[PDB]
Design an enzyme around this catalytic site. Structure first.
Site, PDB file in Angstrom:
ATOM      1  N   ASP A  25     -24.803  -2.988   1.357  1.00  0.00           N
ATOM      2  CA  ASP A  25     -24.450  -3.271   2.700  1.00  0.00           C
ATOM      3  C   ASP A  25     -24.422  -2.120   3.666  1.00  0.00           C
ATOM      4  OD1 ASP A  25     -23.483  -4.642   5.072  1.00  0.00           O
ATOM      5  OD2 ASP A  25     -21.716  -5.488   4.066  1.00  0.00           O
ATOM      6  N   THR A  26     -25.636  -1.835   4.565  1.00  0.00           N
ATOM      7  CA  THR A  26     -25.612  -0.790   5.330  1.00  0.00           C
ATOM      8  C   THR A  26     -24.814  -0.986   6.674  1.00  0.00           C
ATOM      9  OG1 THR A  26     -27.420  -1.906   6.432  1.00  0.00           O
ATOM     10  CG2 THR A  26     -27.882   0.049   5.037  1.00  0.00           C
ATOM     11  N   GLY A  27     -24.343  -2.427   6.823  1.00  0.00           N
ATOM     12  CA  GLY A  27     -23.231  -2.892   7.727  1.00  0.00           C
ATOM     13  C   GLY A  27     -21.945  -2.616   7.526  1.00  0.00           C
TER      14      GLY A  27
HETATM   15  C1  LIG Z   1     -21.715 -15.349  -2.558  1.00  0.00           C
HETATM   16  C2  LIG Z   1     -21.330 -15.628  -1.116  1.00  0.00           C
HETATM   17  C3  LIG Z   1     -19.917 -15.584  -0.895  1.00  0.00           C
HETATM   18  C4  LIG Z   1     -22.259 -14.764   0.129  1.00  0.00           C
HETATM   19  N1  LIG Z   1     -22.555 -15.269   1.308  1.00  0.00           N
HETATM   20  C5  LIG Z   1     -23.564 -14.356   1.870  1.00  0.00           C
HETATM   21  C6  LIG Z   1     -23.960 -14.718   3.162  1.00  0.00           C
HETATM   22  N2  LIG Z   1     -22.934 -14.399   4.291  1.00  0.00           N
HETATM   23  C7  LIG Z   1     -21.656 -15.286   4.734  1.00  0.00           C
HETATM   24  C8  LIG Z   1     -23.374 -13.471   5.207  1.00  0.00           C
HETATM   25  O1  LIG Z   1     -24.440 -12.637   5.081  1.00  0.00           O
HETATM   26  N3  LIG Z   1     -22.555 -13.351   6.216  1.00  0.00           N
HETATM   27  C9  LIG Z   1     -22.564 -11.943   7.095  1.00  0.00           C
HETATM   28  C10 LIG Z   1     -21.332 -10.934   6.992  1.00  0.00           C
HETATM   29  O2  LIG Z   1     -20.125 -11.138   7.630  1.00  0.00           O
HETATM   30  N4  LIG Z   1     -21.705 -10.068   6.065  1.00  0.00           N
HETATM   31  C11 LIG Z   1     -20.601  -9.074   5.810  1.00  0.00           C
HETATM   32  C12 LIG Z   1     -20.311  -9.058   4.296  1.00  0.00           C
HETATM   33  C13 LIG Z   1     -20.115 -10.423   3.796  1.00  0.00           C
HETATM   34  C14 LIG Z   1     -20.856 -11.152   2.887  1.00  0.00           C
HETATM   35  C15 LIG Z   1     -20.620 -12.383   2.307  1.00  0.00           C
HETATM   36  C16 LIG Z   1     -19.357 -12.962   2.306  1.00  0.00           C
HETATM   37  C17 LIG Z   1     -18.585 -12.183   3.311  1.00  0.00           C
HETATM   38  C18 LIG Z   1     -18.790 -10.836   3.604  1.00  0.00           C
HETATM   39  C19 LIG Z   1     -20.975  -7.526   6.011  1.00  0.00           C
HETATM   40  C20 LIG Z   1     -21.257  -7.061   7.429  1.00  0.00           C
HETATM   41  O3  LIG Z   1     -21.980  -5.931   7.341  1.00  0.00           O
HETATM   42  C21 LIG Z   1     -20.183  -6.859   8.459  1.00  0.00           C
HETATM   43  C22 LIG Z   1     -20.553  -6.650   9.897  1.00  0.00           C
HETATM   44  C23 LIG Z   1     -19.414  -6.191  10.725  1.00  0.00           C
HETATM   45  C24 LIG Z   1     -19.178  -4.937  11.127  1.00  0.00           C
HETATM   46  C25 LIG Z   1     -18.296  -4.568  11.969  1.00  0.00           C
HETATM   47  C26 LIG Z   1     -17.247  -5.563  12.497  1.00  0.00           C
HETATM   48  C27 LIG Z   1     -17.521  -6.945  11.876  1.00  0.00           C
HETATM   49  C28 LIG Z   1     -18.569  -7.280  11.117  1.00  0.00           C
HETATM   50  N5  LIG Z   1     -19.232  -5.743   8.015  1.00  0.00           N
HETATM   51  C29 LIG Z   1     -18.178  -5.652   7.551  1.00  0.00           C
HETATM   52  O4  LIG Z   1     -17.462  -6.608   7.248  1.00  0.00           O
HETATM   53  O5  LIG Z   1     -17.496  -4.254   7.648  1.00  0.00           O
HETATM   54  C30 LIG Z   1     -16.247  -4.324   7.181  1.00  0.00           C
HETATM   55  C31 LIG Z   1     -16.539  -4.096   5.590  1.00  0.00           C
HETATM   56  C32 LIG Z   1     -17.157  -4.777   5.009  1.00  0.00           C
HETATM   57  N6  LIG Z   1     -17.171  -4.863   3.634  1.00  0.00           N
HETATM   58  C33 LIG Z   1     -16.648  -3.803   3.329  1.00  0.00           C
HETATM   59  S1  LIG Z   1     -16.001  -3.105   4.697  1.00  0.00           S
HETATM   60  C34 LIG Z   1     -22.675 -12.469   8.557  1.00  0.00           C
HETATM   61  C35 LIG Z   1     -22.756 -11.477   9.531  1.00  0.00           C
HETATM   62  C36 LIG Z   1     -23.910 -13.427   8.496  1.00  0.00           C
HETATM   63  C37 LIG Z   1     -23.743 -13.330   1.126  1.00  0.00           C
HETATM   64  S2  LIG Z   1     -22.755 -13.367  -0.214  1.00  0.00           S
END
Ligand SMILES: CC(C)c1nc(CN(C)C(=O)N[C@H](C(=O)N[C@@H](Cc2ccccc2)C[C@H](O)[C@H](Cc2ccccc2)NC(=O)OCc2cncs2)C(C)C)cs1
Lengths: 99, 99
Positions: A25-27
């Site tokens: 996760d680059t984000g």
């Molecule tokens: C197995 C199931 C649970 C899964 N669903 C998914 C699909 N989903 C929901 C996503 O891709 N969701 C994305 C997301 O929030 N991704 C997130 C990871 C994630 C994935 C899945 C479930 C929960 C969290 C990851 C994103 O890079 C967010 C972006 C961000 C940055 C700054 C401020 C707010 C937000 N970054 C962070 O949350 O950074 C904080 C940190 C995250 N992880 C460690 S520290 C949305 C932006 C679309 C992947 S795995």
């Protein structure tokens, strides 16, 4: 290896003798795992996400194997729905974005 | 170009005639922007993440320029703390992870 993004960038990692899959996760600044057992002391910490904030434990100097690569860093353990390898560790295996 | 991960991977984008900075996020399936004004109809949608979920508007077929690269795709607009460019658009510019 090179990885395209047509699918979620999953990697297999080993940490604390346990096996898991994590998302490159680059984000994400940090690395977080949902329930794994790590030893020793930690400190309370809150992470901010898309849907709000979560309380986690913060462990430092934790050995971790990411795709055969050995590295050590800070690992958070908390109620994430997905295990995530952040920039704090992707930086250690030389991982970059390209286009 | 190539982008190491010592710093958050931010890119400059133009969308709906407005300028913005966004995070190239390999851990995001979709692309989300906080407060931008996009034309047209949209469909309510919920997105999950660390911290919980949020209600967002889903616009399809939205022309967006990402580091000078002109592509089109689905763009979500909603209460997000950071503008994110997901895999849905990253694949469009041929962006890959390498290590
Ligand atoms: C197995 C199931 C649970 C899964 N669903 C998914 C699909 N989903 C929901 C996503 O891709 N969701 C994305 C997301 O929030 N991704 C997130 C990871 C994630 C994935 C899945 C479930 C929960 C969290 C990851 C994103 O890079 C967010 C972006 C961000 C940055 C700054 C401020 C707010 C937000 N970054 C962070 O949350 O950074 C904080 C940190 C995250 N992880 C460690 S520290 C949305 C932006 C679309 C992947 S795995």
């Amino acid at each position: 290896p090179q990885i395209t993004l047509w699918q979620r960038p999953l990697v297999t990692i080993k940490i604390g003798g346990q096996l898991r899959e994590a998302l490159l996760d680059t984000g994400a600044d940090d690395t977080i795992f949902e329930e794994i057992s790590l030893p020793g002391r930690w400190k309370p910490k809150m992470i901010g996400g898309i849907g709000g904030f979560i309380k986690v434990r913060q462990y430092d100097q934790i050995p971790i194997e990411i795709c055969g690569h050995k590295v050590i860093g800070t690992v958070l353990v908390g109620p994430t729905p997905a295990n995530i390898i952040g920039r704090n560790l992707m930086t250690q295996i030389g991982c970059t974005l390209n286009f």
